[PDB]
C-alpha cells in the first residue's frame, strides 16, 4: 500500500514517514518488509516479497527471484517514464528517503539493525545487471547518503556545542562535567556509526556506478558528490573526493559533463576561503577552459559561467591565452554562450566623461580581435552586462566631436561609429540581431517604456548632432554609410515639436553634399533610404523634405540629360573619364529610383537610348549597363504602381516598354560579361514574375491587358544560365564563398520561383532535379522545395519530369562512357539511389506512378540494337525502385503495357530486364 | 522478457584513462555568427521561406514590393 501512496499521493511527505515509523515502533519486521517492497516496487518490479523470504532468503537470492516474478510489460521503469505525473514520482521518491533518515536521525538510525538492512538491500540491487534495479537503488543509495551527511553534520555541531558547554564548566561540581564528557563520548560513538554507513554506501555504491555504463547513473552520482562537498564542505571538500569530479569532467556523455560543472559551481559561488580548490584548479584549469567550446552548448555556457566564478575568486590563475580564448566566444552563434562570454569580458576588463575610458576600451577590443567586420554581435553579447555604458550616447558623441583635453585614429573613429550604430539599433527596435533572438518575443510593458524613452533620447540627441558628424566625416565613405542609418530609428514627431527644424535643414544640406561627392554604391543606397524615411505621410515634415528631394533630383536630371547628348553622339568617340562622369550621375539616379517615385521625371528615354547603344556597338562599360537595366526596371515598376481612374490608355504604352525591355535583357543575358548576365537574368526572373498570370490572381481584373509569357527561346536561354553559372564544379577564405553561394542560391531561387508558379513549362525542372543528390548542401534545400510544390500542382506531370531528370542522367552517362558501361558502378549506383529517393515522393499518388513507368519503359526500348538480338535496357534496374510504391492492382495494369514491347523471346547482358519484372 | 538487462555494468580502468587523455571528440571549433555585414542580410533573406517570397533584385519601396507580392497565391 506504500508504493501508490508516494506516486498518487498528494499527501505531505513527512506525514507518510511518521505514520511509517509508528508501524516500525509497533513491530519492526512487518515495517521493514514493506520498506523493502517499497524499493522493489519503486523499480517497477511487479513482484512481492514474503515473510519466509526475509526470514531465511539471502539478498542475492531475493533479487534473483524478483527478476523472475518481475512480470514487466515493457522495458520502461518508473525513473525512465515521461509526464509530470512521474516527475512528481522522482521527487516524492527522493523526499521519502531523505525525510525517513532525518526523522530517524535520533535514536533509531543507531539500533544497528534497520539502516544496516536497507543499505545491504540497496547495495545489492545497485549491482544487478537489471537496469531498473541498478538505477533505482543507486538513486536511492545516493539520496540516503546525503541524508546521512546532514545527520553527520548535526553530530558535528552538537558535539562542538557540548565542547563549549564543557570548557565553560571547567572555567567555573565536577559531576556536572563528568556527565558532559560521557555525552561527548556518546556523540563520538554516534558519529562513528554514521561514518561507517557513509563509507558502506560510498565504497559500496558510489565508487562503482559513478563510472557505470548507463550515462543517467553517472549523472546521478556526480550531482550528489557535488552536494556533499557543498553542504558539509569541512569534511568532504578534500581531493580524495574532488578527484571523482575532475575525472568525470572528461566523460563523453554531455549530461554528465554538465552535472560536473554545476556541482563545481556550487563550490565557487560559496567562494568561502577556497584553498583546496586552488590545487584542483591547477590541474583542471586547462580542461575547464577547453569546455567553453564543448560540443554540447549547455556545457559550454556553464564552463564560461564557471570561469567567471574562478575569476572573482582569484583572478591570478587564468594566464593570457586562456582569457583571450573566452573573449572570442562573444562572436559565437549561440546567444547563451555569447552573453555569458561577455559577462566574463565585462568582469575582466571594465571596472570627456566617466564611461569615456570604458568606450575607448570597447573600441580597442573590437579592433584587436579581428573575427567580425562589424559590431552587431559584439553589442548583443554585452547588452545584458553593460547596458548603461552601451546607451551613453553623449559619451560617444563627445568622443567623436570634442577635440582632446591634454587623440583618436581614423580606424578607431570608423569603429566607434560602428559600435554606436549597433547600440542605437538594438535600443530602438528591442530585439537582438538575426541568429541570436529566440523568436518574436513580445515586448514587456516595462520594456515598451524603456523602448520609447531612449528612442526619443536618440532622436532628440542626434537630430542636432548627426549633421555635425556628417560634416566632419563627409569624406570617408565607409563612415558616412553607418551615419546615414540613424534616421531609420528616429521618432520624426520630435523634429516639429521643439525648435529643431533648423537642424533637419543642416542635415539635408549635408546629405545632398555627400551625394554630390561620392560614387560608392553603398553610400547612395543609404542616402536613398534616408530620404525614403524622411518622406513619410504621417509626420509633420513630408513637405520640407520632398522639396529637397525633388530639388535635388532636378539638379540630377538636368546634368544626366546634358551628359547623354555628348556621350551618345555619332561623331565623337567618348573616353574613359567621360564614362566615369555618366556612371557617377547614373549611380546617383539608379539608387534613388528604387525608393522614390521618379516617373515624374520619365527617365525611360535616356536609358532606353543608352541600352540600344550597348547592344548595337558592343562597347559599353559593365557598370553602366548594370546600372542602366536597374534604373530601367525601376521606371517600369513605378509606372505600374500607379495603375482605373488613372488614365485608361497609356496601358499599352507601358506594355511596349515592358516588351522591348524584355528583349533588351534577352540580348544582354547572352553577353560574355559574367556580372552583366547576373543583373540581366535577375531583372528577367523578377519581371516575368510581376507581369505574369497572377497579376489579377487576387483582385485587379482590370490589370489583365498587360500580357507577357516567355518565349520557348527565352526559357531555354534562362535555364542555360542556371546550368553554366549556378551548377559549377565542386577568393578570401570562407567569408567570401558563403557570400558567393548565398548569391548563387538567390539566383536558383528566382528561377524556381518561375517553375512552381507556371511562368515556364514544368519540364524545364528536370535539369535541376537531377542535381538534388549532387548539390544537397549547396542548393538541396531549394530543390526539394520546388519539387514538393510541383507535386502539389500537377501530381502526374511531376512524375514525367522526375523521370526526365533520370532519363537525362542516363544519356549523361553514355555520353562519356559508352553503352557497355558497368551497371553497378558508384556512378550508376547513385542514379539507382536517386531513384529510391525519388519514389519516396509518393492521396492520388496512383495515376502518376503509372504514367511514370510508361515513360520509363517507352524510353528503355526507344532505340533498338542496330547489331544484335537492343539499347537502353539498363534504365529498368533504375525504374525497379519505383515498383515498391506501386499498387497491388498495377502488377497487372502495367505489365501488359510492358508486354506491349517485351516479346515471348526476350523473357527466355539482359539482367536489367529480369529484375524489372521481378518487382511485380 | 523485454526487461532491460545490461551485460556490461561498469566502464573499465583503461577506457577512463583514454577519456582523460583525449577529450578531442567532445570539443569543437567556434560557430561564428555572420562575420560580415552582408552575410547578416543574406542570412535573414536566405532559406526557402524568404527566398521564394521575395524578389531577386531587392525592392526598397514598399509599393514596388507589393507588385511582386501581389502575384503570390
Amino acid at each position: 500500500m506504500l508504493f501508490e501512496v508516494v506516486k498518487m499521493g498528494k499527501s505531505a511527505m513527512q506525514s507518510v514517514v511518521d505514520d511509517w515509523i509508528e508501524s516500525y515502533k509497533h513491530d519492526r519486521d512487518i515495517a521493514l518488509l514493506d520498506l523493502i517492497n517499497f524499493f522493489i516496487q519503486c523499480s517497477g518490479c511487479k513482484g512481492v516479497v514474503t515473510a519466509e523470504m526475509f526470514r531465511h532468503m539471502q539478498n542475492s537470492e531475493i533479487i534473483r527471484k524478483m527478476t523472475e516474478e518481475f512480470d514487466e510489460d515493457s522495458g520502461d521503469y518508473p525513473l525512465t517514464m515521461a509526464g509530470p505525473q512521474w516527475k512528481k514520482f522522482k521527487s516524492s521518491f527522493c523526499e521519502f528517503i531523505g525525510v525517513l533518515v532525518r526523522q530517524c536521525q535520533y535514536s533509531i538510525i543507531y539500533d544497528e539493525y534497520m539502516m544496516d538492512t536497507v543499505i545491504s538491500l540497496l547495495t545489492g540491487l545497485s549491482d544487478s545487471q537489471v537496469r531498473a534495479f541498478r538505477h533505482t537503488s543507486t538513486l536511492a543509495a545516493m539520496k540516503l547518503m546525503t541524508a546521512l551527511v546532514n545527520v553527520a553534520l548535526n553530530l558535528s555541531i552538537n558535539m562542538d556545542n557540548t565542547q563549549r558547554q564543557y570548557e565553560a564548566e571547567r572555567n567555573k561540581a565536577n559531576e556536572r562535567l563528568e556527565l558532559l564528557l560521557q555525552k561527548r563520548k556518546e556523540l563520538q560513538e554516534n558519529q562513528d556509526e554514521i561514518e561507517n554507513m557513509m563509507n558502506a554506501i560510498f565504497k559500496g555504491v558510489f565508487v562503482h556506478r559513478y563510472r557505470d555504463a548507463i550515462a543517467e547513473i553517472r549523472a546521478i552520482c556526480i550531482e550528489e558528490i557535488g552536494i556533499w562537498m557543498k553542504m558539509y564542505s569541512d569534511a568532504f571538500l578534500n581531493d580524495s573526493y574532488l578527484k571523482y569530479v575532475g575525472w568525470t569532467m572528461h566523460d563523453k556523455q554531455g549530461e554528465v559533463r554538465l552535472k560536473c560543472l554545476t556541482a563545481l559551481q556550487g563550490l565557487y559561488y560559496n567562494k568561502e576561503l577556497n584553498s583546496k580548490l586552488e590545487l584542483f584548479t591547477s590541474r583542471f584549469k586547462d580542461r575547464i577552459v577547453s569546455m567553453t567550446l564543448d560540443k554540447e552548448y549547455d556545457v559550454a555556457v556553464q564552463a564560461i559561467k564557471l570561469l567567471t566564478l574562478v575569476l572573482q575568486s582569484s583572478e591570478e590563475v587564468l594566464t593570457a591565452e586562456d582569457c583571450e580564448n573566452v573573449y572570442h566566444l562573444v562572436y559565437s552563434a549561440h546567444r547563451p554562450v555569447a552573453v555569458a562570454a561577455g559577462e566574463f569580458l565585462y568582469k575582466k576588463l571594465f571596472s570627456q566623461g566617466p564611461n569615456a575610458n570604458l568606450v575607448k576600451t570597447l573600441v580597442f577590443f573590437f579592433l584587436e580581435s579581428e573575427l567580425h567586420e562589424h559590431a552587431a554581435y559584439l553589442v548583443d553579447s554585452m547588452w545584458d552586462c553593460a547596458t548603461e555604458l552601451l546607451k551613453d550616447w553623449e559619451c560617444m558623441n563627445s568622443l567623436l566631436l570634442e577635440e582632446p583635453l591634454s587623440a583618436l585614429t581614423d580606424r578607431q573613429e570608423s569603429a566607434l561609429i560602428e559600435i554606436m550604430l549597433c547600440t542605437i539599433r538594438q535600443a530602438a527596435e528591442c530585439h537582438p540581431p538575426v541568429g541570436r533572438g529566440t523568436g518574436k518575443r513580445v515586448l514587456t510593458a516595462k520594456e515598451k517604456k524603456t523602448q520609447l524613452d531612449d528612442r526619443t533620447k536618440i532622436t532628440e540627441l542626434f537630430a542636432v548632432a548627426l549633421p555635425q558628424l556628417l560634416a566632419k566625416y563627409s569624406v570617408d565613405a565607409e563612415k558616412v554609410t553607418n551615419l546615414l542609418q540613424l534616421p531609420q530609428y528616429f521618432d520624426l514627431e520630435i523634429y516639429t515639436t521643439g525648435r529643431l527644424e533648423k537642424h533637419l535643414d543642416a542635415l539635408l544640406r549635408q546629405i545632398r553634399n555627400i551625394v554630390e561627392k561620392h560614387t560608392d554604391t553603398d553610400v547612395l543606397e543609404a542616402c536613398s533610404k534616408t530620404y525614403h524615411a524622411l518622406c513619410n505621410e504621417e509626420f509633420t515634415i513630408f513637405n520640407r523634405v520632398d522639396i529637397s528631394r525633388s530639388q535635388l533630383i532636378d539638379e540630377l536630371a538636368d546634368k544626366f540629360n546634358r551628359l547623354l547628348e555628348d556621350f551618345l553622339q555619332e561623331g565623337e568617340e567618348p573616353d574613359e573619364d567621360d564614362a566615369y562622369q555618366v556612371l557617377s550621375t547614373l549611380k546617383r539616379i539608379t539608387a534613388f529610383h528604387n525608393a522614390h517615385d521618379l516617373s515624374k521625371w520619365d527617365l525611360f528615354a535616356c536609358n532606353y537610348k543608352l541600352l540600344k547603344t550597348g547592344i548595337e556597338n558592343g562597347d559599353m562599360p559593365e557598370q553602366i549597363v548594370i546600372h542602366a537595366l536597374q534604373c530601367t526596371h525601376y521606371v517600369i515598376l513605378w509606372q505600374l504602381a500607379k495603375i482605373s481612374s488613372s488614365t485608361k490608355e497609356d496601358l499599352l504604352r507601358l506594355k511596349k516598354q515592358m516588351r522591348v525591355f524584355c528583349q533588351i535583357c534577352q540580348h544582354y543575358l547572352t553577353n560574355v560579361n559574367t556580372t552583366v548576365k547576373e543583373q540581366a537574368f535577375t531583372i528577367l526572373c523578377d519581371i516575368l514574375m510581376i507581369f505574369s498570370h497572377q497579376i489579377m490572381s487576387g483582385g485587379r481584373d482590370m490589370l489583365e491587358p498587360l500580357v507577357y509569357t516567355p518565349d520557348s527561346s527565352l526559357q531555354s536561354e534562362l535555364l542555360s544560365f542556371i546550368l553554366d553559372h549556378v551548377f559549377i564544379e565542386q577568393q578570401e577564405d570562407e567569408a567570401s564563398k558563403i557570400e558567393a553561394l548565398h548569391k548563387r542560391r538567390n539566383l536558383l531561387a528566382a528561377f524556381c520561383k518561375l517553375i512552381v508558379y507556371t511562368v515556364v513549362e514544368m519540364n524545364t525542372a528536370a535539369d535541376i532535379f537531377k542535381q538534388y543528390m549532387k548539390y544537397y548542401n549547396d542548393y538541396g534545400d531549394i530543390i526539394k522545395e520546388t519539387m514538393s510544390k510541383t507535386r502539389q500542382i500537377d501530381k502526374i506531370q511531376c512524375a514525367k519530369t522526375l523521370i526526365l531528370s533520370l532519363q537525362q542522367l542516363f544519356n549523361e552517362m553514355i555520353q562519356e562512357n559508352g553503352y557497355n558501361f558497368d551497371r553497378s558502378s558508384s556512378t550508376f549506383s547513385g542514379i539507382k539511389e536517386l531513384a529510391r529517393r525519388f519514389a519516396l515522393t509518393f492521396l492520388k499518388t496512383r495515376e502518376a506512378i503509372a504514367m511514370l513507368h510508361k515513360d520509363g519503359i517507352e524510353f528503355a526500348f526507344k532505340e533498338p540494337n542496330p547489331q544484335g538480338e537492343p539499347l537502353n535496357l539498363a534504365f529498368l534496374d533504375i525504374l525497379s525502385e519505383f515498383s515498391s510504391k506501386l499498387l497491388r492492382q498495377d502488377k497487372r495494369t502495367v505489365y501488359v503495357y510492358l508486354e506491349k514491347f517485351m516479346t515471348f523471346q526476350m523473357s527466355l547482358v539482359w539482367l536489367p530486364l529480369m529484375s524489372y519484372r521481378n518487382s511485380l | 522478457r523485454k526487461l532491460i538487462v545490461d551485460s556490461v555494468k561498469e566502464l573499465d580502468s583503461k577506457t577512463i584513462r583514454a577519456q582523460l587523455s583525449d577529450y578531442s571528440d567532445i570539443v569543437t571549433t567556434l560557430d561564428l555568427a555572420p562575420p560580415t555585414k552582408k552575410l547578416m542580410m543574406w542570412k535573414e533573406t536566405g532559406g526557402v521561406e524568404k527566398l521564394f517570397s521575395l524578389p531577386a533584385q531587392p525592392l526598397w519601396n514598399n509599393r514596388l514590393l507589393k507588385l511582386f507580392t501581389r502575384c503570390l497565391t
Partner: peptide, 9 residues
Amino acid sequence: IDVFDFPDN
C-alpha cells in the same frame, strides 16, 4: 596532484 592521477589497479 598525485591523488588526481588515476591509479593502475
